[PDB]
Amino acid sequence: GPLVLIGSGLSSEQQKMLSELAVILKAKKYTEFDSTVTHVVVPGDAVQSTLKCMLGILNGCWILKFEWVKACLRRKVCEQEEKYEIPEGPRRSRLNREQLLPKLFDGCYFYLWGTFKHHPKDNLIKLVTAGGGQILSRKPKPDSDVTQTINTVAYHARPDSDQRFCTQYIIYEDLCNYHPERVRQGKVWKAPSSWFIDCVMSFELLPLDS
Ligand SMILES: [Cl-]
């Protein structure tokens, strides 16, 4: 298809330059993230811990250093994206979706507990859904647990982690003076919002017990 570009953390001069490139490439340039976005450009050589970037990772977009815009504009060409792609999380996710593999939170369920202020609740719901996870409207417990109705696993869990098959998460906003006594009860973990965000930024289902 058509390319759809967006910038995260770009200066005004950078955003103009991105629009200039979209014209050269016959592409769209947006300011709000959408599932049609193909390319997220960052200002330097590092991922931004922003919603736009995180949505771009969960979508397996190209997350590219601003040098890509400079290079394309000097050549009037869509330069080869892999040579400008941010490594680690972005790249692993891009490859994951090219191979039509499960999204990061496939087989995972999330219940958003308590008050959210510094990780907006809307943001977390966006990210859950974008990563292929399921938002729960009632606190998870065994007598209502859908994972008994069909074998449910989390593809991105490490091989030998309980998170392969214990895939349900109570998420709380960290540092409310709350560390739990047990991080896991049955199939349900209690995890801070800061863990969830770290999983996204890394494209990993990071361990809670190990
Ligand atoms: Cl079964």
From Swiss-Prot:
Residues 1-86, 100-210 form the BRCT domain. One of its GO terms (molecular function) is ubiquitin-modified histone reader activity. GO terms for biological process: cellular response to ionizing radiation; chromatin remodeling; DNA damage response; DNA repair; DNA strand resection involved in replication fork processing; homologous recombination; mitotic G2/M transition checkpoint; negative regulation of apoptotic process. GO terms for cellular component: BRCA1-A complex; BRCA1-B complex; BRCA1-BARD1 complex; BRCA1-C complex; cytoplasm; cytoplasmic ribonucleoprotein granule; nuclear speck; nuclear ubiquitin ligase complex. It is found in: Nucleus. It comes from the Eukaryota. Processed during apoptosis. The homodimer is more susceptible to proteolytic cleavage than the BARD1/BRCA1 heterodimer. Keywords: ANK repeat, DNA damage, DNA repair, Isopeptide bond, Metal-binding, Nucleus, Phosphoprotein, Repeat, Transferase, Ubl conjugation, Ubl conjugation pathway, Zinc, Zinc-finger. E3 ubiquitin-protein ligase. The BRCA1-BARD1 heterodimer specifically mediates the formation of 'Lys-6'-linked polyubiquitin chains and coordinates a diverse range of cellular pathways such as DNA damage repair, ubiquitination and transcriptional regulation to maintain genomic stability. Plays a central role in the control of the cell cycle in response to DNA damage. Acts by mediating ubiquitin E3 ligase activity that is required for its tumor suppressor function. Also forms a heterodimer with CSTF1/CSTF-50 to modulate mRNA processing and RNAP II stability by inhibiting pre-mRNA 3' cleavage. Homo- and heterodimer. Heterodimer (RING-type zinc finger) with BRCA1. Heterodimer (via ANK repeats and BRCT domains) with CSTF1/CSTF-50. Component of the BRCA1-A complex, at least composed of the BRCA1, BARD1, UIMC1/RAP80, ABRAXAS1, BRCC3/BRCC36, BABAM2 and BABAM1/NBA1. Interacts with UBXN1. This is BRCA1-associated RING domain protein 1. The gene is BARD1. The chain holds residues 568 to 777 of 777 of the full protein.
